């Protein structure tokens, strides 16, 4: 009864979140990927400096 009630409440709270959060997760994770290229360009420039 709990796995019926809570997980259907979980899947509703997840999918209402994932319609809103996975858009801003891609806003978060692709901006995290900008940091790993800004760091890799920083080291080769500091090596060349």
């Amino acid at each position: 009864t709990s796995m019926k009630i809570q997980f259907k409440t979980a899947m509703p709270p997840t999918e209402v979140l994932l319609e809103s959060i996975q858009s801003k997760v891609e806003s978060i994770e692709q901006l995290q990927r900008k940091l790993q290229h800004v760091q890799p360009l920083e080291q080769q420039n500091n090596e060349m400096c």
Binding site: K24, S27, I28, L31, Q32, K34, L35, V38, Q39, L41, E42, N45, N46, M48, C49
Partner: protein, 58 residues
């Protein structure tokens, strides 16, 4: 997410600071190379004069 944009901008400014300084080290080196060019070229011209003159005198 707003915190991540502020962190990301700080990295880009460090990229311009290193880029400005590495250009400046190259810019100082470029003026020295051109001056070292003319000193070597004048030395070569004086040498080619001396090699020709010494055969002409003899």
């Amino acid at each position: 997410d707003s915190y991540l944009k502020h962190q990301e901008i700080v990295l880009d400014t460090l990229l311009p600071q290193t880029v400005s300084n590495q250009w400046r080290i190259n810019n100082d080196y470029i003026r020295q190379t051109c001056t070292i060019v003319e000193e070597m070229n004048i030395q070569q011209r004086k040498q080619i004069n001396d090699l020709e003159i010494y055969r002409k005198r003899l």
